[PDB]
Design an enzyme around this catalytic site. Structure first.
Site, mmCIF file in Angstrom:
data_model
loop_
_atom_site.group_PDB
_atom_site.id
_atom_site.type_symbol
_atom_site.label_atom_id
_atom_site.label_comp_id
_atom_site.label_asym_id
_atom_site.label_seq_id
_atom_site.Cartn_x
_atom_site.Cartn_y
_atom_site.Cartn_z
ATOM 1 N N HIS A 62 -4.131 -6.663 -4.942
ATOM 2 C CA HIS A 62 -4.461 -5.248 -5.164
ATOM 3 C C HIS A 62 -4.786 -4.891 -6.619
ATOM 4 O O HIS A 62 -5.364 -3.841 -6.904
ATOM 5 C CB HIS A 62 -3.411 -4.289 -4.553
ATOM 6 C CG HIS A 62 -1.985 -4.736 -4.702
ATOM 7 N ND1 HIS A 62 -1.144 -4.241 -5.678
ATOM 8 C CD2 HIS A 62 -1.242 -5.603 -3.971
ATOM 9 C CE1 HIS A 62 0.052 -4.794 -5.549
ATOM 10 N NE2 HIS A 62 0.017 -5.622 -4.521
ATOM 11 N N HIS A 92 -0.418 -3.279 -14.926
ATOM 12 C CA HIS A 92 -1.569 -3.630 -14.108
ATOM 13 C C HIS A 92 -2.633 -2.561 -14.292
ATOM 14 O O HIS A 92 -2.409 -1.553 -14.980
ATOM 15 C CB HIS A 92 -1.163 -3.718 -12.640
ATOM 16 C CG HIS A 92 -0.672 -2.423 -12.086
ATOM 17 N ND1 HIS A 92 0.652 -2.046 -12.140
ATOM 18 C CD2 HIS A 92 -1.330 -1.404 -11.484
ATOM 19 C CE1 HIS A 92 0.790 -0.854 -11.588
ATOM 20 N NE2 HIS A 92 -0.398 -0.442 -11.184
ATOM 21 N N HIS A 94 -6.246 -0.273 -12.552
ATOM 22 C CA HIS A 94 -7.042 0.247 -11.448
ATOM 23 C C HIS A 94 -8.413 0.491 -12.031
ATOM 24 O O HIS A 94 -8.521 0.895 -13.173
ATOM 25 C CB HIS A 94 -6.462 1.570 -10.957
ATOM 26 C CG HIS A 94 -5.036 1.469 -10.528
ATOM 27 N ND1 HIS A 94 -4.670 1.161 -9.234
ATOM 28 C CD2 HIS A 94 -3.884 1.602 -11.226
ATOM 29 C CE1 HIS A 94 -3.352 1.122 -9.151
ATOM 30 N NE2 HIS A 94 -2.851 1.382 -10.345
ATOM 31 N N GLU A 104 -6.964 6.734 -11.581
ATOM 32 C CA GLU A 104 -6.262 7.337 -10.454
ATOM 33 C C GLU A 104 -5.990 8.793 -10.778
ATOM 34 O O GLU A 104 -6.378 9.680 -10.024
ATOM 35 C CB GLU A 104 -4.984 6.566 -10.127
ATOM 36 C CG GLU A 104 -5.257 5.124 -9.684
ATOM 37 C CD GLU A 104 -4.143 4.555 -8.865
ATOM 38 O OE1 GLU A 104 -2.979 4.583 -9.329
ATOM 39 O OE2 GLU A 104 -4.430 4.087 -7.739
ATOM 40 N N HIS A 117 -1.452 1.018 -16.022
ATOM 41 C CA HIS A 117 -0.088 1.476 -15.750
ATOM 42 C C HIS A 117 0.930 0.493 -16.285
ATOM 43 O O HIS A 117 0.964 -0.668 -15.859
ATOM 44 C CB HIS A 117 0.162 1.620 -14.243
ATOM 45 C CG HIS A 117 -0.600 2.745 -13.622
ATOM 46 N ND1 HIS A 117 -0.919 2.781 -12.278
ATOM 47 C CD2 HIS A 117 -1.100 3.880 -14.159
ATOM 48 C CE1 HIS A 117 -1.588 3.891 -12.023
ATOM 49 N NE2 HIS A 117 -1.713 4.576 -13.148
ATOM 50 N N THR A 196 1.822 4.716 -6.913
ATOM 51 C CA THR A 196 0.523 4.977 -6.265
ATOM 52 C C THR A 196 0.106 3.910 -5.251
ATOM 53 O O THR A 196 -0.972 3.984 -4.654
ATOM 54 C CB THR A 196 -0.611 5.232 -7.277
ATOM 55 O OG1 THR A 196 -0.909 4.029 -7.989
ATOM 56 C CG2 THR A 196 -0.201 6.289 -8.278
HETATM 57 ZN ZN ZN Z 1 -0.856 1.482 -10.766
HETATM 58 ZN ZN ZN Z 2 1.686 -6.475 -3.540
#
Ligand code: ZN
Ligand code: ZN
EC number: 4.2.1.1
Length: 258
Positions: A62, A92, A94, A104, A117, A196
């Site tokens: 993800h 990590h 996004h 986000e 984040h 999130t």
């Molecule tokens: Zn995040």
């Molecule tokens: Zn995971």
């Protein structure tokens, strides 16, 4: 139907497995600068990353994530709206399928190219297991990315991404200094919210910085080379791995700046 970001398993489906997805304090949210009111009582944020010890970097299907040794009070977050001291466990990102989207949180409905984040847990709750059960058990420092000059501090991360292209790959990732990921100003917005991603627990004090960091197109292009899929599986490019803004409901967003 393991969760993801696509048509068939994305954010619109998450509530079926995690009904808190329609909860009262879900994240991210849009930050409207007319209604995000300055709070002179808010203390300056305290970010102490100088003794941070990174462990590994991984593609978890993800995002990509860099992990830290949280066994003692090295890289910690405190002050601001926070009670007690919070230990960094991971960061990590996004991002989008194009520069015009990816973040986000939004500010006055504007989407940034990416969002970083930094996830921390409250030591006053003993361990990460008890922390996530508490409304302020986690603090997440959110930082917007816009496309411009390169961030030297981001280079060591993007330059290893080719070694973790597919879901489940990982690599030793030591002596990375997260100080290089921060903007000049620590001016921030704060509100109570959630993870999130599943399980979407409503356990986060969100601290979103006003100042985006600038990263180069070259750098963000390396984000978009990642895959959602495993090695040798049909290619599902890891892009648009962001949850859209959720209803603010009763909540107040506070600004630390005038
Ligand atoms: Zn995040
Ligand atoms: Zn995971």
């Amino acid at each position: 139907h393991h969760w993801g970001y696509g048509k068939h398993n994305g954010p619109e489906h998450w509530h079926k497995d995690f009904p808190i997805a329609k909860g009262e304090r879900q994240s991210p949210v849009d930050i409207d600068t007319h209604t995000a009111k300055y709070d002179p009582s808010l203390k300056p944020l305290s970010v102490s990353y100088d003794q941070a010890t990174s462990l590994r970097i991984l593609n978890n299907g993800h995002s990509f994530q860099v992990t830290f040794d949280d066994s003692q009070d090295k890289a910690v977050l405190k002050g601001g709206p926070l009670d007690g001291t919070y230990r960094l466990i991971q960061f990590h990102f996004h991002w989008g399928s194009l520069d015009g989207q990816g973040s986000e949180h939004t500010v006055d409905k504007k989407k940034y190219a990416a969002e970083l984040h930094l996830v921390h847990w409250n030591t006053k709750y003993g361990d990460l297991g008890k922390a996530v059960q508490q409304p302020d058990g986690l603090a997440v420092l959110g930082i917007f990315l816009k496309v411009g000059s390169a961030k030297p501090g981001l280079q060591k991360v993007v330059d290893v991404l080719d070694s973790i292209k597919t879901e489940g790959k990982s690599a030793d990732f030591t002596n990375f200094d997260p100080r290089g990921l921060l903007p000049e100003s620590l001016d921030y917005w704060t509100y109570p919210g959630s993870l999130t991603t599943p399980p979407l627990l409503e356990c986060v004090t969100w601290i979103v910085l006003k100042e985006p960091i600038s990263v180069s197109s070259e750098q963000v292009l390396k984000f978009r080379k990642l895959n959602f899929n495993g090695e040798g599986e049909p290619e599902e490019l890891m892009v648009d791995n962001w949850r859209p803004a959720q209803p603010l409901k009763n909540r107040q967003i506070k600004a630390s700046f005038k």
